[PDB]
Design a binder for these strands. Structure first.
Ligand SMILES: [Mg+2]
Ligand SMILES: [Mg+2]
Ligand SMILES: [Mg+2]
Ligand SMILES: [Mg+2]
Ligand SMILES: [Mg+2]
Ligand SMILES: [Mg+2]
Ligand SMILES: [Mg+2]
Ligand SMILES: [Mg+2]
Ligand SMILES: [Mg+2]
Ligand SMILES: [Mg+2]
Ligand SMILES: [Mg+2]
Ligand SMILES: [Mg+2]
Ligand SMILES: [Mg+2]
Ligand SMILES: [Mg+2]
Ligand SMILES: [Mg+2]
Ligand SMILES: [Mg+2]
Ligand SMILES: [Mg+2]
Ligand SMILES: [Mg+2]
Ligand SMILES: [Mg+2]
Ligand SMILES: [Mg+2]
Ligand SMILES: [Mg+2]
Ligand SMILES: [Mg+2]
Ligand SMILES: [Mg+2]
Ligand SMILES: [Mg+2]
Ligand SMILES: [Mg+2]
Ligand SMILES: [Mg+2]
Ligand SMILES: [Mg+2]
Ligand SMILES: [Mg+2]
Ligand SMILES: [Mg+2]
Ligand SMILES: [Mg+2]
Ligand SMILES: [Mg+2]
Ligand SMILES: [Mg+2]
Ligand SMILES: [Mg+2]
Ligand SMILES: [Mg+2]
Ligand SMILES: [Mg+2]
Ligand SMILES: [Mg+2]
Ligand SMILES: [Mg+2]
Ligand SMILES: [Mg+2]
Ligand SMILES: [Mg+2]
Ligand SMILES: [Mg+2]
Ligand SMILES: [Mg+2]
Ligand SMILES: [Mg+2]
Ligand SMILES: [Mg+2]
Ligand SMILES: [Mg+2]
Ligand SMILES: [Mg+2]
Ligand SMILES: [Mg+2]
Ligand SMILES: [Mg+2]
Ligand SMILES: [Mg+2]
Ligand SMILES: [Mg+2]
Ligand SMILES: [Mg+2]
Ligand SMILES: [Mg+2]
Ligand SMILES: [Mg+2]
Ligand SMILES: [Mg+2]
Ligand SMILES: [Mg+2]
Ligand SMILES: [Mg+2]
Ligand SMILES: [Mg+2]
Ligand SMILES: [Mg+2]
Ligand SMILES: [Mg+2]
Ligand SMILES: [Mg+2]
Ligand SMILES: [Mg+2]
Ligand SMILES: [Mg+2]
Ligand SMILES: [Mg+2]
Ligand SMILES: [Mg+2]
Ligand SMILES: [Mg+2]
Ligand SMILES: [Mg+2]
Ligand SMILES: [Mg+2]
Ligand SMILES: [Mg+2]
Ligand SMILES: [Mg+2]
Ligand SMILES: [Mg+2]
Ligand SMILES: [Mg+2]
Ligand SMILES: [Mg+2]
Ligand SMILES: [Mg+2]
Ligand SMILES: [Mg+2]
Ligand SMILES: [Mg+2]
Ligand SMILES: [Mg+2]
Ligand SMILES: [Mg+2]
Ligand SMILES: [Mg+2]
Ligand SMILES: [Mg+2]
Ligand SMILES: [Mg+2]
Ligand SMILES: [Mg+2]
Ligand SMILES: [Mg+2]
Ligand SMILES: [Mg+2]
Ligand SMILES: [Mg+2]
Ligand SMILES: [Mg+2]
Ligand SMILES: [Mg+2]
Ligand SMILES: [Mg+2]
Ligand SMILES: [Mg+2]
Ligand SMILES: [Mg+2]
Ligand SMILES: [Mg+2]
Ligand SMILES: [Mg+2]
Ligand SMILES: [Mg+2]
Ligand SMILES: [Mg+2]
Ligand SMILES: [Mg+2]
Ligand SMILES: [Mg+2]
Ligand SMILES: [Mg+2]
Ligand SMILES: [Mg+2]
Ligand SMILES: [Mg+2]
Ligand SMILES: [Mg+2]
Ligand SMILES: [Mg+2]
Ligand SMILES: [Mg+2]
Ligand SMILES: [Mg+2]
Ligand SMILES: [Mg+2]
Ligand SMILES: [Mg+2]
Ligand SMILES: [Mg+2]
Ligand SMILES: [Mg+2]
Ligand SMILES: [Mg+2]
Ligand SMILES: [Mg+2]
Ligand SMILES: [Mg+2]
Ligand SMILES: [Mg+2]
Ligand SMILES: [Mg+2]
Ligand SMILES: [Mg+2]
Ligand SMILES: [Mg+2]
Ligand SMILES: [Mg+2]
Ligand SMILES: [Mg+2]
Ligand SMILES: [Mg+2]
Ligand SMILES: [Mg+2]
Ligand SMILES: [Mg+2]
Ligand SMILES: [Mg+2]
Ligand SMILES: [Mg+2]
Ligand SMILES: [Mg+2]
Ligand SMILES: [Mg+2]
Ligand SMILES: [Mg+2]
Ligand SMILES: [Mg+2]
Ligand SMILES: [Mg+2]
Ligand SMILES: [Mg+2]
Ligand SMILES: [Mg+2]
Ligand SMILES: [Mg+2]
Ligand SMILES: [Mg+2]
Ligand SMILES: [Mg+2]
Ligand SMILES: [Mg+2]
Ligand SMILES: [Mg+2]
Ligand SMILES: [Mg+2]
Ligand SMILES: [Mg+2]
Ligand SMILES: [Mg+2]
Ligand SMILES: [Mg+2]
Ligand SMILES: [Mg+2]
Ligand SMILES: [Mg+2]
Length: 68
RNA sequence: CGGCUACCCACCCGACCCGUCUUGAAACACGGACCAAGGAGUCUAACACGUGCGCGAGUCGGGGGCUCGCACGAAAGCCGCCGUGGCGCAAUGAAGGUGAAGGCCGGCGCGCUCGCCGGCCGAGGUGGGAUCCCGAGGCCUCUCCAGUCCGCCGAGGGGCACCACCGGCCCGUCUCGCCCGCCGCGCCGGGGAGGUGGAGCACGAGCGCACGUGUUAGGACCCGAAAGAUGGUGAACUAUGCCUGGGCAGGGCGAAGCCAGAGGAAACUCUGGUGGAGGUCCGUAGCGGUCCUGACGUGCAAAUCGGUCGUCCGACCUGGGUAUAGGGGCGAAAGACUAAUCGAACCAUCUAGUAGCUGGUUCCCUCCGAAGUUUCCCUCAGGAUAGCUGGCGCUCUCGCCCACGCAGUUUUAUCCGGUAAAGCGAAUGAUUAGAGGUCUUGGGGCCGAAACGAUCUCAACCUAUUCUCAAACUUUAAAUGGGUAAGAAGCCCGGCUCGCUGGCGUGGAGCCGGGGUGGAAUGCGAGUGCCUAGUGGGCCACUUUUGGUAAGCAGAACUGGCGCUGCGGGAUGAACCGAACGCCGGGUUAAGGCGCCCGAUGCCGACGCUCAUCAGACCCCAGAAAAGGUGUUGGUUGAUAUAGACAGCAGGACGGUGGCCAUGGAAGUCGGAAUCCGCUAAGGAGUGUGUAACAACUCACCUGCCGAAUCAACUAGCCCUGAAAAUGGAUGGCGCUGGAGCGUCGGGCCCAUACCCGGCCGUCGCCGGCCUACGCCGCGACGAGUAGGAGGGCCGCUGCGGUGAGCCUUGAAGCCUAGGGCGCGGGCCCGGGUGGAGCCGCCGCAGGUGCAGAUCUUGGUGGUAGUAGCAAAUAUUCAAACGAGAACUUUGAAGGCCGAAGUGGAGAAGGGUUCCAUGUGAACAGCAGUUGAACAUGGGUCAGUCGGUCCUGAGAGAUGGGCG
RNA sequence: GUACCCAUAUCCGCAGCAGGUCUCCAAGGUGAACAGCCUCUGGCAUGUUGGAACAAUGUAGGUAAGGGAAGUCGGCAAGC
RNA sequence: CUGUUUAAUUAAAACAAAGCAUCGCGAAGGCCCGCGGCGGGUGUUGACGCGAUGUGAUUUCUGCCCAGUGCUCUGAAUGUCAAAGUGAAGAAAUUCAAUGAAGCGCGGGUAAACGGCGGGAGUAACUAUGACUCUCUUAAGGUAGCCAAAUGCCUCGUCAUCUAAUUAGUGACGCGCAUGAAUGGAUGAACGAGAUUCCCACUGUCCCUACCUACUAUCCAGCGAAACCACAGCCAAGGGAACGGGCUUGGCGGAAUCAGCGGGGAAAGAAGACCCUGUUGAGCUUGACUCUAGUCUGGCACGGUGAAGAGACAUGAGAGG
RNA sequence: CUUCUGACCUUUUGGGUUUUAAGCAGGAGGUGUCAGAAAAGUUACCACAGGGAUAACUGGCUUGUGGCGGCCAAGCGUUCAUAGCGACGUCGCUUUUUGAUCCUUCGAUGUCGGCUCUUCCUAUCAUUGUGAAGCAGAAUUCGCCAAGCGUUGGAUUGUUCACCCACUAAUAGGGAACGUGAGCUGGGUUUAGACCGUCGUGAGACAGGUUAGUUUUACCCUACUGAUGAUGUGUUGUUGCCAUGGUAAUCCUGCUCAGUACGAGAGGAACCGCAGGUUCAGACAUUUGGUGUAUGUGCUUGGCUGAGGAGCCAAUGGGGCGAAGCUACCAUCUGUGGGAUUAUGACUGAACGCCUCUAAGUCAGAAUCCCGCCCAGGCGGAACGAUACGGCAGCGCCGCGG
């Protein structure tokens, strides 16, 4: 009662049927796992961007449109 | 005259018997004698997903009620103040409980990491994103003005679905914090800011019906066990008691008791009779069954027969009645017997019990098409999980100087490794040998009373060297290989925000706006989701490799193949070498081959080698080495030959010197040291022949005749030796020798389903037409296939609603058919003949729906075959009769057997009319029959005194009683 | 109740199956005898068929010159 | 010894058996059955009996071990000790303590109860063998006997006899792998359908076969099946699932047959009884696991009357260091 | 599941207070078969579903082990490497030893040994023909062609093997599914009974020993043996031929040769021949012996026919003789030559001016081989005979024409 124990034959020819493609990798990669201190920085950074970035950036857009 | 045909026959070539387990099937693996009918994935519940329909934040009457009692009405219809209820619309906590809105602007409180107020909008934002919109400019017959109208658009705008990310909100917890509320001021509530767990929200998509697939529970694809439980039936065989009856020829051995005689003093002894005891001896019936391992062994028989046997007054044999009943009985004990069954009887039910295990698993065509691997399991014949497959789609991309994305690939850069190899005078580990040196000893020798007093030697040590190694060593270090990059997600500029960081407006991230896509080669359409079958027993080949002596052995790596696969070669084959398959006509080739089987060299083919008394003849491959050859053929390196070798013929083979060792010979000749010189042409102070010794003689050495190559080693091609196995045999055979062998090649030639060209069918894709739009044509690329999956079937069987002014007694169904056809088929249509009363087409619908098998079930018939076989116990013959008919019936005669423990005369149990007569001879009697126990008709069993009835026995059984 | 078989053909054994089954009566000769053999009373046609011939092998039986276990696991079988 | 047994493979050396032992029990008992009752059986019985075993005539014998394992007797002797009962803490559920039946452990006996019975080293005026001596050691270390046996591996042990020759048979030897005393040892007249060897007589068992009879078998008259059967049946070699009939290449091959014969058809019988797997079972056994009838105890009821003594509690007085 | 810890935690079901219990969060108590069942043995009385995924028997690959060889030459062999051996090493062959593997069969291939019987191999024990020896003769040893023909009788053990006695010319080695069970035998192994020893507390085990223990069927096809036959020649018969197949003869002794050769002697040959024998084959029955049912003859037991006479029955009643026939190595008879050649020995003669058996040529040469002699004669053929009345016929050769 003895059988062939382990092999890796006929494995590459199975793997390359559908193809060994890459893992997609879309834009704006997943941001979990990054440094919590940096993340606590960047969240308040974003919400205060969206808070105070109206007036002076609108001024600078008017200024750069007047220049060009 | 034409004709395909399931008619028959001839011929060439191909051609092993199907189904399944299997890596492998024609297998000396299993199932199948033949034929007809039956025969296997159904139904319900539940779930998931896809599909079709209706309604839609709803939906559903499936439970009831309502209508007159009408076949189809067990239908259908209605309810809505019948929505009770299911599922969903809201999740989350263990629970107490709690429970999804933000954005934009203006202002205030220190706008302070902070809260409040006022207005408006309303599910935030970033990058892609089908579509839509706008549009510079572009183009339509003289020049001006014209409008629709035409179409491409660089670029720009809003942006569906969906994807990716950030931000927001709810609930549970954790951390840090301060403020507010007051049916009552408290170990009371409410709130804030962060990081986390959630099956969440972030404008909802379900519900009902039906169909498909898959999974699970059910007898659940079909058949299959040894078992277990419940409840009953058996002691007619057998086991053992008990009761009541029955049975056992003759003989041999000769105890107790007795008698007589003799002896003795007594005790008692001796001799001859009588006597008839024995779990006693030979042997009959009876009972058993040892041996022949005899006969038989599809028998006479599901345990017999024939010889030969054991025991027969006994623990004997035996009939009837009666008792003991299944985990129980009984057992002189063998686990034997208990109705042909016993190491747990028989019958029915639970029961269609269970099975990871064998066997089977029924119509066609089209398309796609595997795996025998990872992990886990009391897992190792199995399952779950990934991987491989198929189906269903969906989202984009095309068509009208350049795209998106991708890659079993290369290049250009750039990293990584520690194997092949190499290395030890580089570490570690082993290891050979020589040389040099003088510190250290011990040990040898010598000068010496002794002294590192001096010296020689030894080992050890060190120094540079030298030979060989390493999977568990290494400085070095390949080839093959692995990753990344080769641009708009990128550059560059400018600015805002940050509680993070901090000399610094510093760093880093994020956000916003702007600017310029031509950034290696080559090829292609890509991305993505669901469901899920089969698979989880492998094997071979090149190369690299582990264990082993080795294997057609076991175990690995990379790639291919076989399995799942044909075809052309290797004769024959799974795996080899070419090459992969729709059906065909022409041409060409591949791998191979061209004496003849057998298509092609039937070339005035090229060059050489080899003769075998066992030749040789093509990867895998199907038998051979070490060694040797003056067999021949090349080749290498030397040595001789013109001042003549080489072998052949001819001449000699001395002298100082019978030199010396000896006096056994030796005057070169068994043995010993040696060894010079002269003459020459050269002689060896003599190789040997032979006289025991003296001697002729030769060899070494020398010279003539001679005429041109010769000698010695060594090497590799063919061939030979080495070479021996069982039935007679294998380059395939026949054969084959100026080849039909070996090696080198050439020119022609042969052919596979490969390639090309052309036709035809189908699939797929890309379309085209306002012609069954589910049809029609057009274009082009392709078609293999087991397990498996889908699609189509105007394939088929049976039934139901609809329809064909369907079909038929002027002949339907079914059956047969050397008849005519169609389709690639499933099958069908017509003709002809039987046949005698129902049948089909189409659109839907619903199934107990299609046979070769399952040692399938039932029914029938073959081959074997007019065969084996009608043989245990001696045996018949003649005449006559009745009769269609006489080996068997009956009578006579004759000859026989059974031979009184019978083949006789009568009974018990059992059988039930068989008893008897008459009549028949169809079937039965295993041949026949006038016969019978066969069939048909009709008869026969007479009792106070024969027995049952009556009695009790072994026992069985009722009331009283007790238990249940 | 009373027939009949009571068994190599009326029972059981799947049957007209050499199997099995309970008892009584039992002559003459030989002989010890109901031993085996032959007759008599009393039954019977040879046991589910016949004819022709006399091969092998058989199955049952019987002899053998010399030697007497040499055969064979064994004197098994047969013979004394 | 006679007897009996596995009917349908064994006839025995097995079984019983008389004889010998051993054990329980004086009836409110032993040993059993039974679902149940003082229901049955032994029992219509009473130790010369009933019940349960071992051994197996007589004759002669019955050795040594209580360590293990059983069995048994003994005492609340004292550790362990279950319900119920007592007492304490607590609002109570509950908790704790003391007391403590059987049994277990402690102690005694038993081997005609199961069973068991050593190995070294030296040592005698030729060598060997070794009575003796020392040591470790167990509970005891095989005593009387007996043997290459039915028990002895090595093994065809060694010697003698038997035969020409003997792995056989007998007789003796004994540090006997691993003999042995009721697990019975050793003899032993009679008898074994028991097993083995040799001798005499006898013979077809043989050298060596031959013949004869009966019944078949043969042919014919009649009447006639069954097993089995993919297809059918000539061989060599090769390859192949590795030993073809069928494939390939060769050898070759005439219809239809009868009587034989057993080489083949890996013939036919039978889903291998040997082996392995199964998470398939049944017999059995015990110091496997989980239980249970039966049984031994303790408690509570049925369950009463009379007398006496005490353990300890309840109360207070006196001694008490 | 238990246990412990943490919160002024939650729930403890009509509402409260307290005990208790449940819960959240995180630590421990174990699953060593370690992703975790709680677990002893035996079956020879066994059963069931299966496996050739998996042993025992053969077959196949392999050749360590076994057996059989070859090369080199240190030595042994009085001297002397190779007459005969040969270490140290080394290369092979064999499948008759054992082992390895699991490829085939587990819905069965009957398993050891013996008896009988056929054929084959050669790695030759003897015989024929030869060569070499440390071959004087004899007796041996080693080689070559060579498997034609032989290779026995017995005691033991079941044996293969082994060992022994005796014969012999010699007691060679093997294969064919470890040939051969529808041929036997069943002694052993290998069931169920039983005993003994060891082991196990036990059911029981023991390639430890002893003993008793059912061996099935052929009529199918092929093969083989034997017998009818079948095709063509018109029929049919006689006489025959031979293609092909089969093959059988073999060995020893005595007497002369001769106690001669040879040998110091002890010892001791060979050829031709002449007698026989062994083994085998083919016959045959005059003799000898069997057989005996001419049921031939004559005794004889018991019974039967009244008795003598004649007979009969007793599964051929017994035994005494015995015809014919069948038969025996238990009687007798017969068994035979030609050719090419192998091994070897030579001749002539080059290669190689010599030599040489070889290179071309030749010769002698045998139990081998083939044929003769001897068996059977084919989908093989000859030569010859007669070739169909009766009453028409019928049938042949020749000529025809339709
Ligand atoms: Mg596997
Ligand atoms: Mg299987
Ligand atoms: Mg296999
Ligand atoms: Mg097949
Ligand atoms: Mg089959
Ligand atoms: Mg069959
Ligand atoms: Mg049918
Ligand atoms: Mg509601
Ligand atoms: Mg059970
Ligand atoms: Mg039961
Ligand atoms: Mg019952
Ligand atoms: Mg009875
Ligand atoms: Mg007696
Ligand atoms: Mg006697
Ligand atoms: Mg007798
Ligand atoms: Mg008798
Ligand atoms: Mg009997
Ligand atoms: Mg009998
Ligand atoms: Mg028999
Ligand atoms: Mg027979
Ligand atoms: Mg007697
Ligand atoms: Mg039972
Ligand atoms: Mg029975
Ligand atoms: Mg079923
Ligand atoms: Mg069933
Ligand atoms: Mg597995
Ligand atoms: Mg797919
Ligand atoms: Mg490495
Ligand atoms: Mg290396
Ligand atoms: Mg499936
Ligand atoms: Mg599997
Ligand atoms: Mg392998
Ligand atoms: Mg394998
Ligand atoms: Mg497969
Ligand atoms: Mg493939
Ligand atoms: Mg292929
Ligand atoms: Mg081919
Ligand atoms: Mg080939
Ligand atoms: Mg082929
Ligand atoms: Mg073509
Ligand atoms: Mg070519
Ligand atoms: Mg040709
Ligand atoms: Mg050469
Ligand atoms: Mg040849
Ligand atoms: Mg296809
Ligand atoms: Mg009618
Ligand atoms: Mg129709
Ligand atoms: Mg029809
Ligand atoms: Mg129906
Ligand atoms: Mg059906
Ligand atoms: Mg059918
Ligand atoms: Mg089928
Ligand atoms: Mg069948
Ligand atoms: Mg049938
Ligand atoms: Mg039939
Ligand atoms: Mg016959
Ligand atoms: Mg017949
Ligand atoms: Mg008869
Ligand atoms: Mg008449
Ligand atoms: Mg008449
Ligand atoms: Mg008759
Ligand atoms: Mg008689
Ligand atoms: Mg009678
Ligand atoms: Mg009849
Ligand atoms: Mg009549
Ligand atoms: Mg009558
Ligand atoms: Mg009647
Ligand atoms: Mg009267
Ligand atoms: Mg009376
Ligand atoms: Mg009663
Ligand atoms: Mg009467
Ligand atoms: Mg009878
Ligand atoms: Mg009888
Ligand atoms: Mg009488
Ligand atoms: Mg009388
Ligand atoms: Mg008298
Ligand atoms: Mg009869
Ligand atoms: Mg005789
Ligand atoms: Mg005689
Ligand atoms: Mg005699
Ligand atoms: Mg013997
Ligand atoms: Mg006898
Ligand atoms: Mg006699
Ligand atoms: Mg009895
Ligand atoms: Mg018997
Ligand atoms: Mg009693
Ligand atoms: Mg005694
Ligand atoms: Mg004792
Ligand atoms: Mg004690
Ligand atoms: Mg208590
Ligand atoms: Mg005491
Ligand atoms: Mg001594
Ligand atoms: Mg002793
Ligand atoms: Mg003798
Ligand atoms: Mg003997
Ligand atoms: Mg002992
Ligand atoms: Mg003992
Ligand atoms: Mg034939
Ligand atoms: Mg063959
Ligand atoms: Mg092969
Ligand atoms: Mg073969
Ligand atoms: Mg062979
Ligand atoms: Mg066959
Ligand atoms: Mg053929
Ligand atoms: Mg025949
Ligand atoms: Mg036969
Ligand atoms: Mg089976
Ligand atoms: Mg398993
Ligand atoms: Mg059983
Ligand atoms: Mg409560
Ligand atoms: Mg309450
Ligand atoms: Mg695990
Ligand atoms: Mg068990
Ligand atoms: Mg037993
Ligand atoms: Mg296998
Ligand atoms: Mg095998
Ligand atoms: Mg088979
Ligand atoms: Mg068989
Ligand atoms: Mg066979
Ligand atoms: Mg021969
Ligand atoms: Mg054999
Ligand atoms: Mg036997
Ligand atoms: Mg035996
Ligand atoms: Mg036995
Ligand atoms: Mg016997
Ligand atoms: Mg035949
Ligand atoms: Mg001939
Ligand atoms: Mg005579
Ligand atoms: Mg005579
Ligand atoms: Mg006579
Ligand atoms: Mg007389
Ligand atoms: Mg007279
Ligand atoms: Mg007379
Ligand atoms: Mg008479
Ligand atoms: Mg007579
Ligand atoms: Mg003869
Ligand atoms: Mg010659």
């Amino acid at each position: 009662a003895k059988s062939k124990n382990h092999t890796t034959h006929n494995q590459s020819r199975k793997w390359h049927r559908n193809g060994i493609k890459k893992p997609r990798s879309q834009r704006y990669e997943s941001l979990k796992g990054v440094d919590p201190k940096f993340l606590r920085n960047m969240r308040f950074a974003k919400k205060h961007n969206k808070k105070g970035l109206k007036k002076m950036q609108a001024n600078n857009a008017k200024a750069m449109s007047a220049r060009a």
